[model samples]
Target: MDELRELLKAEQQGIKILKEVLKKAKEGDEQELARLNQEIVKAEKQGVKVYKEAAEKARNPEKRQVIDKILEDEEKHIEWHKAASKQGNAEQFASLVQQHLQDEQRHVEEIEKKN
Candidate 1:
């Protein structure tokens, strides 16, 4: 229970830091934002690759299925980031962010369906 509490506290701190970083990113220069977005997309693609490899190596059927779902969601995240990158300005970026939230919800729904 103590360890779980510490983990939860760390999670909350991480969330707080993420919110601060996101706010700064939104207010930062366009090029910086684009660079960060591109980096995130690349990282997510790497996540997909890693998840795929894990799934391939997984001997347990249930574990493989879970990894596959993670891979699917990571692929969707890459798609979302790619689409977001195409947006022209702050106005369009805001729209894309809204769309991303919906896409994330859809991804979660699909994953739940698989379970």
Candidate 2:
């Protein structure tokens, strides 16, 4: 239980940092933007790894599937970030982000159906 708490804390801290970095990047600054991009990459990698580990630790298919869905969402997020990094246009970037987010949202809906 203690270890789980620590893990959750770490995850939350990483998320907070990533979110702040992203916010700042969006507001515009060269060095901060580059730093945030790196942070985003790291966060996505951690998200995928943690979700896979959580799924593996589960004792049943249902629990495993829950984590699997989260991993799928992370994969979509990474793809969106990759595409966004290539495109500087606000309209195009927003479109891909929305598309990817919707796909992930659908994956969550699938998990809810399973539950």
Candidate 3:
């Protein structure tokens, strides 16, 4: 219960940062992405299975697959956040950040579903 909640909050923070960048991005927007990367990493910083702890306190094999799925999403998000941040200009950065934002929202729902 506790760990997954933290993971969800962390994911929400990433989205919050993502929005900040998208809005701020249309406007240097480098800092927010970095924070997003930081927090995204922290999402799994709890231990991939910690997300599972909520499910794994561990459920069946299905629970293992679920959190691992989430963990994979987190890693993918991490890569994109970094990729998005490294963009050549606000134009590209904003675009990629928007992409990341959308993904973050889905992952939040994944947790909601698994949650």
Candidate 4:
């Protein structure tokens, strides 16, 4: 769990920076949108894998369940990012990404709740 939090903190920092960059750019351009989406996809893929490992390593069953469910959520997010990478709808994608960000926060809250 400690290792997972460390990894997540680092990854979350990267994601934050990427989101800031994305926010500054004109998402209307296909090329720019594609680039941002690629970053998002890359970050999300790493997060999903890490989250899955974290879930597996969780010592408590309840924590494990919450983390496992969060892993599933991340899996869906990965798919969303992957698809967004190709389609490049900046506005729609950004909105969904924001929701996913909140979902990640919720995952952390859920884990803490278990503790």
Which tens-of-lDDT digit does each residue in 4-113 have in candidate 1?
23222322332333343365456756776676676656655665666676667777777577667756766775676677554455555555555555544444454355
Question: Considering every candidate listed, which one attains the maximal TM-score?
Answer: 4
TM-scores, one per candidate:
0.58, 0.61, 0.66, 0.69
Name the weakest run of 10 consecutive residues (lDDT summed) in model 4: 1-10
Candidate 1 lDDT at 85 equals 55
The local lDDT score (0 to 100) that residue 53 gets in candidate 3 is 57
Q: Stretches of candidate 4 above 4 Å error?
A: 1-4, 14-18, 21-26, 85-88, 113-115
Candidate 3 to truth, TM: 0.66
Q: Candidate 3's residue-wise lDDT over 25-102, tens digit each? A: 565646754665566566544545456455555456665666677777767766665554454557776676667778
> What TM-score does candidate 4 reach?
0.69
Q: What stretches of model 2 exceed 4 Å from their correct place? A: 1-14, 89-115
Each model's backbone clash number: 0, 0, 1, 0
User: What's the CA RMSD for each of the models?
Assistant: 6.7, 5.1, 3.7, 3.4
lDDT at 56 for candidate 1? 77
Per-residue lDDT tens digits for candidate 2, residues 1-115, read: 1123323432454456555654554566655655666676777668678767777787777777766766776666666566655445344444444554455445445444542
- Local distance difference test, each candidate: 0.54, 0.57, 0.63, 0.62
* lDDT by residue for model 4 (26-83), tens: 3467666666656666766676667677767777777667656766776686676676
